[PDB]
Amino acid sequence: DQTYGPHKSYKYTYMPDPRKLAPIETTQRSEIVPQSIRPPTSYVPNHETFLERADIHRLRPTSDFKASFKDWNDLFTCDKRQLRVRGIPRMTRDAIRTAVQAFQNGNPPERFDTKE
């Protein structure tokens, strides 16, 4: 009728493998394709102007977060994880990061405000 629980606890040793600890040849991908940051335009002079012209959606209230960025380089140095640390909500931070990388590609944050 089985009230007694399992007959054995199967456990395997941990025995470190000298072959898996062997040094790994590494490259940094910043060596293969070098990272860089685009300098501000007259269109987008500040990080705050940027967060203003990337604000389109009612639910992507980008302009409200201006204080959570200290300067220009701070913006383009952010990635999504470290962007979550700073307490920006979800779809908002995706809007932000998307905008940034888009500006990096040569597409400035010029888009019509859909709120109305």
Partner 1 sequence: SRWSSVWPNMRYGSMFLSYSVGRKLPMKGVNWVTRDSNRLLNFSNRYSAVISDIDVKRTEEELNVALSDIRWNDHRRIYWKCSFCGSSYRKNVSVRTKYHAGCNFCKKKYPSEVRGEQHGSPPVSQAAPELTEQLVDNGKRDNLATLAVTSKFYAEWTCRGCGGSYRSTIRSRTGQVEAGQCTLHPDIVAWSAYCPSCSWRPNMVPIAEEVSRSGQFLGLERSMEELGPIPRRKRLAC
Partner 2 sequence: LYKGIPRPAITNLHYEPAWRYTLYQAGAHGAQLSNPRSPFTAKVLGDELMQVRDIKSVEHCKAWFDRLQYLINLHYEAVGDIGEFKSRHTRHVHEFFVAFHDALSSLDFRDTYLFDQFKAVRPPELSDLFGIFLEMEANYVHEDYCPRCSLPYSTTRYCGEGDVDTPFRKHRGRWAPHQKWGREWYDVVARRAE
Partner 3 sequence: KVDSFHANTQYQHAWPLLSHDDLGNSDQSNNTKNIMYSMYMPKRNKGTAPWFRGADTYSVKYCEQGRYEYQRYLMINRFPSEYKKHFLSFLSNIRMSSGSATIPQEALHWLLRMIVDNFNPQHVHYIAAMKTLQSAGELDMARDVWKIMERQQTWPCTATICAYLDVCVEAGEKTWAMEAWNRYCTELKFLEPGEVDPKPISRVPFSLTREELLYLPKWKKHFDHDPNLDVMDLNRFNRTREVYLRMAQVMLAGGERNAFQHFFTKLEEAMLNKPTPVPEPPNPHLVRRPRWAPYEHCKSVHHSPWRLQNNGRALALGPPVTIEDEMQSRFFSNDQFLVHSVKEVLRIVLQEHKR
Partner RNA sequence: UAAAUUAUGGUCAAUUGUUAGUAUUCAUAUUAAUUUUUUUAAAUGUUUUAUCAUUUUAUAAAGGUUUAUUUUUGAAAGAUUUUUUGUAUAAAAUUUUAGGAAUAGUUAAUAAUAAUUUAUAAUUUUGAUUAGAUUGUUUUGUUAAUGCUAUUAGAUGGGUGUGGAAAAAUAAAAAAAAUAAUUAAUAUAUAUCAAUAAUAAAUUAAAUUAAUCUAUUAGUCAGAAAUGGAUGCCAGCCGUUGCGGUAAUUUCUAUGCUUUUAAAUAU
Query: In this chain, which stretch among 17-25, 44-52, 62-70, 108-116 interacts with partner 1, using CB under 8 A?
Result: 17-25
Per CB under 7 A, 24 contacts RNA: no
With CA atoms as reference, report the closest residue to 99 among 47, 58, 59: 47
Pattern 3-32, binding to partner 3, x per CB under 8 A? ---------xxxxxx-xxx-----------
Q: Which of residues 42-101 bind RNA (CB under 7 A)?
A: 57-59, 79-81, 84, 89-91, 94, 97-99, 101
Distance CA 33, CA 116 (A): 41
Per CB under 8 A, 16 contacts partner 2: yes
- Nearer Cβ to partner 2, position 14 or 112? 14
Q: Which residues of 51-63 are buried (b: 16+ CB within 10 A; e: fewer)?
A: bebbbbeeebbbe
Q: Which residues contact 43 (CB under 8 A, 6 or more apart)?
A: 53, 108, 110
Identified binder of partner 2 from the candidate list 6, 9, 15, 105, rule CB under 8 A:
15
Per CB under 8 A, 81 contacts partner 1: no
Compute CA distances 90 → 21, 61, 80, 81, whole Å: 38, 11, 10, 11
